[PDB]
Every structure is written in structure tokens, then in C-alpha cells.
Design an enzyme around this catalytic site. Structure first.
Site, PDB file in Angstrom:
ATOM      1  N   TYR A 255     -20.994  36.246  64.582  1.00  0.00           N
ATOM      2  CA  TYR A 255     -22.106  35.646  63.792  1.00  0.00           C
ATOM      3  C   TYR A 255     -23.519  35.828  64.360  1.00  0.00           C
ATOM      4  CZ  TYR A 255     -18.306  33.700  61.113  1.00  0.00           C
ATOM      5  OH  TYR A 255     -17.152  33.545  60.414  1.00  0.00           O
TER       6      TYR A 255
ATOM      7  N   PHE B  61     -13.438  25.545  65.900  1.00  0.00           N
ATOM      8  CA  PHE B  61     -14.342  25.628  64.736  1.00  0.00           C
ATOM      9  C   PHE B  61     -13.623  25.852  63.389  1.00  0.00           C
ATOM     10  CE2 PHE B  61     -14.502  29.855  66.684  1.00  0.00           C
ATOM     11  CZ  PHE B  61     -14.164  30.669  65.555  1.00  0.00           C
ATOM     12  N   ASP B  62     -12.424  26.428  63.437  1.00  0.00           N
ATOM     13  CA  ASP B  62     -11.663  26.645  62.213  1.00  0.00           C
ATOM     14  C   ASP B  62     -10.209  27.004  62.490  1.00  0.00           C
ATOM     15  OD1 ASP B  62     -11.472  28.016  59.174  1.00  0.00           O
ATOM     16  OD2 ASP B  62     -13.150  26.617  59.483  1.00  0.00           O
TER      17      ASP B  62
ATOM     18  N   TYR C 178      -4.627  31.972  61.770  1.00  0.00           N
ATOM     19  CA  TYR C 178      -5.496  32.041  62.933  1.00  0.00           C
ATOM     20  C   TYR C 178      -5.966  30.665  63.357  1.00  0.00           C
ATOM     21  CZ  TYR C 178      -9.493  31.024  59.960  1.00  0.00           C
ATOM     22  OH  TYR C 178     -10.353  30.427  59.063  1.00  0.00           O
TER      23      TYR C 178
ATOM     24  N   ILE D 259     -15.697  38.932  60.029  1.00  0.00           N
ATOM     25  CA  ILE D 259     -16.562  39.378  61.124  1.00  0.00           C
ATOM     26  C   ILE D 259     -16.079  40.726  61.663  1.00  0.00           C
ATOM     27  CG2 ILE D 259     -17.463  37.066  61.799  1.00  0.00           C
ATOM     28  CD1 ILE D 259     -15.372  37.145  64.034  1.00  0.00           C
TER      29      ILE D 259
END
Length: 125
Positions: free
Chosen positions: A99, A53-54, A43, A73
Site C-alpha cells: 500500500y 489487519f484482515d 489468508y 497488491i
């Protein structure tokens, strides 16, 4: 973010546009993973402004979790359940399905809508 927001399928049960999906690459075979299946994904995740972000590609090691167990999540437990083996999709995820107000600081602010590109590599019972 704007295209999935405009053309994405709402895959939430509540129909609150909380998780919107576009398929980018079809998978192989019709099967989707069952709850408790081990799922293996690659991903890329970006904020609404497009900032990363990642990514599992940083170490290039797939991300592995059991489907539906709350190890990820809510958007992922919902979205990955809809995917076929080898499929790549885009998911737009409102904060209630990610989040929330807490965020995941500093990488993910409070009340962040998240954008993911997810490849379902494999899944096993």
C-alpha cells in the site's frame, strides 16, 4: 516477521527484498497458476508489530481474484504465482509491493511492511 526477513526467499525480479517467501506447507502437484487464472485463497494479514489487519477467515469465505491483473497488491500477484495447489506460505511485503506511502487507513499505516499467511485453495483457467 524476523524469521521470514532473515530466511525468506526474495521472489522479486528486482531483488530489492520487496517480497520474501517461506513455504510452511507443501502443496499437491507441481503446477502453479498462470496469469489470468482464477485463484482462491484463505489468508491472514498482520502488520510488522503482529497486529491483525484482515483475514478471509472472519466470514470464512475464500478470497477470489484473477492472477496478475492488479486486483490485489503487487506482493500477491507475485507471490501467489509461485504457489502450488494446497500450499501454505508466509510472505513479507515491503510497502512498495503493498500500500506504499498512502497506506490503507486506518487499518494499514503509511509505509507499512505487511506479513501474510496465504493458503492457495485452488486455481482454474
Amino acid at each position: 516477521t524476523a524469521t521470514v526477513a532473515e530466511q525468506g526467499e526474495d521472489i522479486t525480479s528486482k531483488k530489492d527484498r520487496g517480497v520474501l517467501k517461506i513455504v510452511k506447507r507443501v502443496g499437491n502437484g507441481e503446477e502453479t497458476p498462470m496469469i489470468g487464472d482464477k485463484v482462491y485463497v484463505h489468508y491472514k494479514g498482520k502488520l510488522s508489530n503482529g497486529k491483525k489487519f484482515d483475514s478471509s477467515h472472519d466470514r470464512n469465505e475464500p478470497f477470489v481474484f484473477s492472477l496478475g491483473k492488479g486486483q490485489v497488491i503487487k506482493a500477491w500477484d507475485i507471490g501467489v504465482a509461485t504457489m502450488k495447489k494446497g500450499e501454505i506460505c508466509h510472505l513479507l511485503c515491503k510497502p512498495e509491493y503493498a500500500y506504499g506511502s498512502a497506506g490503507s487507513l486506518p487499518k494499514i499505516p503509511s509505509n507499512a511492511t505487511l506479513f501474510f499467511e496465504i493458503e492457495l485453495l485452488d486455481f482454474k483457467g
